[PDB]
Amino acid sequence: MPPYTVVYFPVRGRCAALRMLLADQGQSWKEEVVTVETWQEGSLKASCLYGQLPKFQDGDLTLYQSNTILRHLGRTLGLYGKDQQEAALVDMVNDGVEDLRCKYISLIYTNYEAGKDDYVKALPGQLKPFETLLSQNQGGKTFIVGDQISFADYNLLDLLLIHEVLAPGCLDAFPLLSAYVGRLSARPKLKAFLASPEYVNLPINGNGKQ
Amino acid sequence: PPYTVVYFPVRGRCAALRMLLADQGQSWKEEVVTVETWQEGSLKASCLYGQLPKFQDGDLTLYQSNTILRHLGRTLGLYGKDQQEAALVDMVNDGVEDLRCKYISLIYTNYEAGKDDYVKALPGQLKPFETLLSQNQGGKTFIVGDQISFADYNLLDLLLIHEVLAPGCLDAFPLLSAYVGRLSARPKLKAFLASPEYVNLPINGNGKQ
Numbered sequence: 306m307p308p309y310t311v312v313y314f315p316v317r318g319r320c321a322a323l324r325m326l327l328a329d330q331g332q333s334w335k336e337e338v339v340t341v342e343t344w345q346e347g348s349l350k351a352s353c354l355y356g357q358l359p360k361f362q363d364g365d366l367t368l369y370q371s372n373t374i375l376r377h378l379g380r381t382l383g384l385y386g387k388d389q390q391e392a393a394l395v396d397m398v399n400d401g402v403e404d405l406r407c408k409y410i411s412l413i414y415t416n417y418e419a420g421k422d423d424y425v426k427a428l429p430g431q432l433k434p435f436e437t438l439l440s441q442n443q444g445g446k447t448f449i450v451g452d453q454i455s456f457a458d459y460n461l462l463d464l465l466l467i468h469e470v471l472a473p474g475c476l477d478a479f480p481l482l483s484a485y486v487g488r489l490s491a492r493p494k495l496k497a498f499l500a501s502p503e504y505v506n507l508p509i510n511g512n513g514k515q
Numbered sequence: 516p517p518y519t520v521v522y523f524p525v526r527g528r529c530a531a532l533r534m535l536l537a538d539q540g541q542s543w544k545e546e547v548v549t550v551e552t553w554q555e556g557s558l559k560a561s562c563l564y565g566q567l568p569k570f571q572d573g574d575l576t577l578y579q580s581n582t583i584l585r586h587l588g589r590t591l592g593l594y595g596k597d598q599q600e601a602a603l604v605d606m607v608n609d610g611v612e613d614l615r616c617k618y619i620s621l622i623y624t625n626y627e628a629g630k631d632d633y634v635k636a637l638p639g640q641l642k643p644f645e646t647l648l649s650q651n652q653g654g655k656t657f658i659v660g661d662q663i664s665f666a667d668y669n670l671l672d673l674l675l676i677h678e679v680l681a682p683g684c685l686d687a688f689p690l691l692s693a694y695v696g697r698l699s700a701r702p703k704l705k706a707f708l709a710s711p712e713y714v715n716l717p718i719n720g721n722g723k724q
């Protein structure tokens with residue numbers, strides 16, 4: 306059996322980025338999918354630390370919280386900076402990614418029809434700090450932090466892809482971002498994952514919006 | 516002092532890292548930012564995400580309260596004994612951050628009409644951290660392992676502000692209650708929490724708590 310197990314609802318959501326990590330890194334993993342009926346039965350839920358998914362297992366290490374998983378994988382597979390200073394910068398990117406993700410998730414599930422124009426109007430000002438980060442790291446030719454990939458790249462990558470779905474062309478205002486996205490998705494294993502039914506046949510979110 | 520904390524004159528998302536610094540005998544400087552200052556827009560335009568806190572470690576400049584916590588935990592050895600404990604630590608902090616966000620939305624966006632439901636949901640919101648204590652040496656040490664981590668300071672602050680928001684919310688949780696007492700009594704932290712620069716600082720900016 307693979308050492309890793311992803312326990313989630315059948316969507317990309319907060320598991321998209323860590324799945325891309327694992328795929329690009331050539332790791333193997335079991336997917337455990339949870340239906341509404343099963344969630345509604347309440348036994349799994351009660352057993353989750355914060356009563357939510359994703360749930361992740363690495364051997365007998367059981368983790369909750371999507372960014373915990375990302376950092377845990379970034380730690381063990383060496384995608385967490387080359388040094389302590391880089392690691393901080395990697396954290397600083399991911400906190401920003403999370404911040405925007407929280408807003409995205411709020412729009413998608415609590416206020417899509419009403420808030421979408423305001424959201425898209427505000428999108429440029431929200432993406433710009435990431436464009437700025439690229440420009441300050443080797444002309445944005447390599448990765449979000451340093452010259453080696455990190456978990457934040459995989460998280461940022463997902464974030465930009467879902468926003469291109471939400472707001473087609475949004476990256477037209479951000480040359481570095483746009484290319485970044487093309488480049489990281491050209492990575493052979495990731496590209497193969499992204500084109501696969503495993504990724505493509507899952508809806509981004511669970512309410513049918515995007 | 517090698518550290519600089521740039522922020523608004525409230526505890527808020529700087530309370531945990533202040534406690535961390537004081538408890539670890541670290542020295543730091545406070546650049547307090549006023550409305551006016553914030554209003555000229557030079558600072559803000561300068562901030563990666565247009566927000567505070569901003570932090571300095573020698574020549575390193577950071578943003579994001581949780582990046583600063585992690586940076587301090589990492590460089591001062593407050594991040595678990597190993598990768599496995601370091602994961603546990605993140606799992607506590609991310610959870611602390613989820614409740615805090617809820618706390619923050621209640622306080623600034625929905626205090627009058629959301630407080631009853633907030634406080635009724637509270638115990639189920641605090642049970643995970645009591646359970647976490649329950650699984651680690653019967654809760655007589657720390658939130659993870661037997662050495663303090665950045666998550667302790669962050670969870671400590673979370674529990675203190677809730678005790679102000681809903682006095683006695685810890686009364687049904689004996690490990691949480693003893694833990695708050697234990698950590699709050701650590702000499703350097705104890706002195707800091709009794710000091711004016713803590714006590715005379717408003718928790719939040721809009722006068723609600």
Ligand SMILES: N[C@@H](CCC(=O)N[C@@H](CS[C@H]1c2c(cc3ccc4cccc5ccc2c3c45)C(=O)C(=O)[C@@H]1O)C(=O)NCC(=O)O)C(=O)O
Nearest residue numbers: 314315316319356357358359370371372414510511512613
């Ligand atoms: N800080 C944590 C947070 C993790 C987290 O949010 N988990 C949620 C995800 S469900 C997710 C969610 C919602 C609505 C729906 C609605 C329809 C739906 C159909 C098919 C699949 C999903 C999957 C997820 C999901 C939803 C669906 C929405 O309303 C929710 O807010 C969430 O965004 C959950 O487990 N909910 C179960 C419950 O609390 O009892 C982390 O980063 O890991």
Ligand SMILES: N[C@@H](CCC(=O)N[C@@H](CS[C@H]1c2c(cc3ccc4cccc5ccc2c3c45)C(=O)C(=O)[C@@H]1O)C(=O)NCC(=O)O)C(=O)O
Nearest residue numbers: 404523524525528565566567568579580581623719720721
């Ligand atoms: N993910 C980040 C989040 C950091 C963050 O939220 N920063 C905010 C803090 S201001 C804080 C805040 C708000 C309202 C007020 C209202 C009155 C007020 C009076 C005196 C002091 C403060 C201090 C903070 C503050 C406020 C006050 C509220 O509306 C805000 O949401 C915040 O909770 C900020 O810099 N605002 C400047 C602006 O963006 O332009 C992190 O973890 O560090």
